[PDB]
TrEMBL record, chains A, D:
Gene Ontology MF terms in the entry: lyase activity
Protein name from the UniProt record: C-deglycosylation enzyme beta subunit
Keyword annotations from UniProtKB, A to Z: Carbohydrate metabolism, Lyase
Pfam family, one: CGDB
Organism: Deinococcus aerius
Chain ranges of the C-glycoside deglycosidase beta subunit domain: 2-108
Top-level division of the source organism's lineage: Bacteria
Family: Belongs to the C-glycoside deglycosidase beta subunit family.
InterPro entries: CGDB
TrEMBL record, chains B, C:
Pfam family, one: AP_endonuc_2
Taxonomic classification: Bacteria, Thermotogati, Deinococcota, Deinococci, Deinococcales
Name by which UniProt lists this protein: Xylose isomerase-like TIM barrel domain-containing protein
Statement: the UniProt record of this protein carries the keyword Lipid metabolism: no
Organism name: Deinococcus aerius
Top-rank taxon, per record: Bacteria
This protein's record includes keyword Metal-binding: yes
InterPro entries: IolE/XylAMocC-like, Xyl_isomerase-like_sf, Xyl_isomerase-like_TIM-brl
UniProt KW keywords: Metal-binding
Length: 123, 322, 322, 123
């Protein structure tokens, strides 16, 4: 869908204890966070667990584990969600490759909608 | 009867996604091409839905007055899989639908594009709520289905004993794909599909060989997973009978004039328009052909998407075929 | 007109296979039921085909005269994949077809049941040969297809620019499968399917949910490979529109009155016969309803197949519906 | 189709150097022996190669390896083919389990039609 735009460019920032970056879901409409069945995040060769993912949409930050409860919250189309990842090891200064795969629980689709992106940002 | 040229703002989803054109910009671009009919995905370009402010709706009406546009169809999306591990109770689906019923009524929309997967029971329960607001509910007939599919037949049998003119159909043009779309073919080729097998698949689609035979044979000749995906694409895209619309002309409220690529000659490569627009014309159709630019997904990774130019060429094609 | 009760000796294929019924016995049993129309699979009941002895055909005519039966339709079988790693040229297909044509002419058959997969090109090239013998070539429309499938539409367009009344259709009764066949259900349950998921699949079939949604959801509830196969059965068995037969009546030479199980009340549990036979009546049908018993392959696991009794019940159900 | 009748009862007899048994193809009509994409026969559960089979339809026997040119030979419906397997081991008296799997390259069917049987015969 928008698989070349998921990892926003020039968005890799260093949060104390982790790294945050902008993500746009590979879908053509606003989708609630509960329907994000899988959001696999890799930051330079290591997949980030869901307990290490906090999605910040607007001013509301939700641990990705508790996303099922966040049915009301909607990921707006084109909105850059700040997907903070509490990486166990700090990202050393320089160029880092961030790649996000998406599996969306679309109701009118028998199988989850799949998107994927892998960009090379820097901090 | 006149077929009105409309545009689904879905067509500009690319430019809206990258914050290159706003909703005002999208409606102005539609007004530039004379395609005053506007079909909107509230979940796509109206953040805050369904909890929008009255000021938003006043601004929407001000937009429409400024650009002479008319809001025609609202695309409702029913998230029956909202809650993991279960489906929405039909009672929950009633209130979720009521949201779009009220949103569309406030926007001034006349039709609601209901997805093809909604059960006829849900359309039966929300029917009184729709009559409260005088809202037409149009089930989307998109490929891999047609006006003779058993699911559509059960919808018809459910809405024949209800006898309500607010229940009807929104046919897609993907049920009139007479060629394997070239944009899809070249996308598959640049995803790692072997070109000769792709030509084979395209010829098989032209011969209407069944998706099962095509998948089996492409597998036998040696096909990568992308190639078997190209073969499975025949399941989705199908060529239905254009004349079948004449039977159901009364229950067709909106047509998604979808397209993938408009060449320099204002020609739609694959989808059958030279055969369908005459059918609508002799069917007495008086509605909107909403330009649904679909090729942006396929010309995405190696081509600059110019949604406005493609939609403009499509609008010219429609104007010529009308 | 009149709808003639006939039988496909395919119905008694179980008895012939185990050498309980000879061809003479099969035709005599058909005569007992009053189902004089005989439909034969030359590759199934008549060894020595294609090159049969000239005395075989005299014996066949003597059989028919003795039992008052009439040979109606010959089931042709085109082995396009006859040669490994190759598809027999259209030239080979032409002579393989002429084989069956001049077998049917000598047998005394009026129709040739062409398989549903033959290309319209092959039907076009063998048409001059079929005019010499005055043989009708009826393409079998059997599930998952119908009179509105793209393949059937291509066949139709190929045979309207030919204008030959020797090209038509042989509708199968699996395109009217009102319910998931109970015999199929119990087979699947005793192949190892989980009963509750099977009831779910049957309900989904009754609701006409698309086979893709059913396959996905059944996969989500813990369906076994046999259970997913039960789900994929939805692809093959489908409920078509019985009213579609009305506009293609002049091209329907033969009807395969397929059935799976006849209960003690002469009732077909699954297929649409109360809906279809009236369609054939009102449209105007003068062909044969060839009883084609098909449950033999599903009850064979544990039940003793009584082909004659099942076909007898089907014959009197047909007689009461006519 | 006829998957309980593939291996014929009371047919396992002993030929010099092997064992022959009657097989009926799990198909509702007569097939050319070339369209038999695979006939996997296991005597006592140990598969024998396709070069150790010699189908004996009627009065002519053809090595199963060269069946692709055995094109016009038809396996008649219900006909007991005397499938011969020259096992590289002399079978001893008693009960022997013979199983046969059939993958038939049917033309009007996208995938090979599959039948299977496993009977317990004796010699
Ligand atoms: Mn559409
Ligand atoms: Mn049939």
């Amino acid at each position: 869908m928008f698989d070349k735009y998921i990892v926003v460019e020039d968005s890799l920032k260093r949060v104390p204890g982790g790294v945050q970056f902008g993500v746009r879901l590979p879908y053509y409409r606003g989708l609630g966070l509960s329907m994000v069945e899988t959001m696999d995040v890799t930051v330079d060769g290591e997949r980030v667990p869901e307990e290490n993912l906090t999605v910040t949409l607007g001013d509301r930050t939700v641990p990705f584990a508790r996303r099922d409860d966040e049915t009301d919250t909607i990921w707006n189309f084109g909105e850059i969600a700040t997907v903070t990842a509490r990486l166990p090891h700090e990202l050393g200064p320089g160029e880092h490759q961030v790649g996000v795969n998406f599996g969306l629980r679309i109701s009118y689709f028998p199988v989850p909608m799949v998107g994927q992106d892998a960009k090379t940002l820097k901090l | 009867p006149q077929i009105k040229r409309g545009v689904s703002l879905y067509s500009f989803q690319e430019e809206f996604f990258l914050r290159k054109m706003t909703l005002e910009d999208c409606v102005a671009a539609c007004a530039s091409m004379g395609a005053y009919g506007i079909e909107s995905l509230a979940e796509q370009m109206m953040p805050g839905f369904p909890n929008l402010d009255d000021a938003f709706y006043d601004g929407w009406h001000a937009m429409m007055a400024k650009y002479g546009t008319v809001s025609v169809c609202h695309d409702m999306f029913l998230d029956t899989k909202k809650f993991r591990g279960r489906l929405m109770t039909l009672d929950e689906q009633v209130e979720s639908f009521v949201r779009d019923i009220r949103h569309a009524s406030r926007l001034g929309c006349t039709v609601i594009r209901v997805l093809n997967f909604v059960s006829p029971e849900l359309m039966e329960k929300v029917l009184p709520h729709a009559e409260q607001s005088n809202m037409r509910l149009g089930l989307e007939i998109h490929a891999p289905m047609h006006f003779e599919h058993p699911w559509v037949l059960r919808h018809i049998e459910f809405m024949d004993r209800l006898g309500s003119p607010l229940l009807g159909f929104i046919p897609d043009m993907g049920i009139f794909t007479k060629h394997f779309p070239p944009v899809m073919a070249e996308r598959l080729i640049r995803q790692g599909a072997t070109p000769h097998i792709i030509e084979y698949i395209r010829e098989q689609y032209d011969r209407r060989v069944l998706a099962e035979y095509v998948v089996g044979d492409v597998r036998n000749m040696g096909g990568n997973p992308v190639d078997i995906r190209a073969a499975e694409m025949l399941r989705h895209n199908n060529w239905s009978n254009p004349r079948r619309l004449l039977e159901h002309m009364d229950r067709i409220f909106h047509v998604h004039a979808k397209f993938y690529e408009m060449d320099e000659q204002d020609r739609e490569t694959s989808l059958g328009y030279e055969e369908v627009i005459p059918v609508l014309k002799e069917g007495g159709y008086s509605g909107y052909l909403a330009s649904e630019y679909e090729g942006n997904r396929h010309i995405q990774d190696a081509f600059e998407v110019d949604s406005v130019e493609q939609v403009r060429r499509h609008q010219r094609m429609l104007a010529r075929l009308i």
